[PDB]
Amino acid sequence: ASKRALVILAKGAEEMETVIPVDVMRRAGIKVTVAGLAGKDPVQCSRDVVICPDASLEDAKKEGPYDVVVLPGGNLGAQNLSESAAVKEILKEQENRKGLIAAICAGPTALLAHEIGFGSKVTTHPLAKDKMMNGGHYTYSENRVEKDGLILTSRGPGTSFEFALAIVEALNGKEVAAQVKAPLVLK
Amino acid sequence: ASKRALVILAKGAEEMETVIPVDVMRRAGIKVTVAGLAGKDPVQCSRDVVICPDASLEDAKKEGPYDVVVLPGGNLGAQNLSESAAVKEILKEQENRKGLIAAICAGPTALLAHEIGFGSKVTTHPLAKDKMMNGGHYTYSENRVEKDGLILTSRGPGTSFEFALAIVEALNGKEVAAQVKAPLVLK
Numbered sequence A, B: 001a002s003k004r005a006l007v008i009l010a011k012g013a014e015e016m017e018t019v020i021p022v023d024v025m026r027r028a029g030i031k032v033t034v035a036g037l038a039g040k041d042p043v044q045c046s047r048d049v050v051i052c053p054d055a056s057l058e059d060a061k062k063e064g065p066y067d068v069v070v071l072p073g074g075n076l077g078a079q080n081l082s083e084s085a086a087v088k089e090i091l092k093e094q095e096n097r098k099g100l101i102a103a104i105c106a107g108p109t110a111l112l113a114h115e116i117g118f119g120s121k122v123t124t125h126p127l128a129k130d131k132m133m134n135g136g137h138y139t140y141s142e143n144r145v146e147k148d149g150l151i152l153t154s155r156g157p158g159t160s161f162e163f164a165l166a167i168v169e170a171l172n173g174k175e176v177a178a179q180v181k182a183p184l185v186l187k
């Protein structure tokens, strides 16, 4: 059975950090649902790319649970994720079932907001470090991708392929990740 | 005055190769128009990400000319671009005015289709090489980004940041490209 990913798409999300993981995960044969935080309507990302979600979050959450919940960055997207009770509930449920939780750039700051994965080693965008670290609830890392416990984090648009491939590795294994990687012409 | 980019978005385009250049160019302060080949309606990309264009190609072409015309890859997107008379006319006009023409992955094969930039050094995705090289009209390169004459090409999703930053360099200069690069957390 194919693994399943939920990608939560909020206004202000970083579109590169949304599309790279969606695309790479679909290359890996993962069933990905792009779920709109606000509803079924198109979402205006940080640099004005407009993406139409596969479903509302309201609907997607009733088709759970998922093998991974993915939080893109973009500062305003992460703020929107951080303010959402629906997101809080999805993440808590994922944590409780010991499922993978993945977040990139400022995305990890929504984990802080919702009190998810405290005690884990995490990375963020450099400019999001101080926010993430408020209270010392996580241990900070400068690795381009980090993984500790349930929590997989990464730093920025430029680490999005590595982040996505780490998700593929976690779900489908190293060999699939390597096979997906090769045609991409990564460095 | 800000430089202007036209990104032509066809069904089957590689969504990473579409969004990375759009986003990076907008970070560089370039005015980017995402123009739908088929019209104003949302476009289903290769891995099923659905992007809403800023305008139809029909409308965008009347707001030209542009400092760069950008052709994403994705094999079926490039086939759609290659079959379009509107694309042909836009590219011919761009060539005639000695403007930049940029294409990635299989995107450069639409240059072949429309007889654009013959004699230039080009790269493509490795799997698109034989198509591009039919007739020996270009000189092939394995550089991750290549630029010769009017024609800027690149290889795949994994070279999209380098491709986008090369476009920024060409239009706005090396310093702007370097400033845009730094926050991205590239290798």
Ligand SMILES: *[C@@]1(=O)C(=O)[N]C2=[C][C]=[C][C]=C21
Binding pocket: A014, A017, A073, A074, A075, A078, A104, A105, A106, A107, A125, A127, A128, A156, A157, B183, B184
């Ligand atoms: C990233 O996408 C984020 O969430 N915050 C930020 C700041 C600068 C560059 C990239 C990012």
Ligand SMILES: *[C@@]1(=O)C(=O)[N]C2=[C][C]=[C][C]=C21
Binding pocket: A183, A184, B014, B017, B073, B074, B075, B078, B104, B105, B106, B107, B125, B127, B128, B156, B157
């Ligand atoms: C690329 O996007 C394209 O146009 N053709 C292709 C084949 C394999 C991987 C990436 C690409």
Ligand SMILES: [Cl-]
Binding pocket: A014, A046, A073, A074, A075, A076
């Ligand atoms: Cl941002």
Ligand SMILES: [Cl-]
Binding pocket: B014, B046, B073, B074, B075, B076
């Ligand atoms: Cl393709």
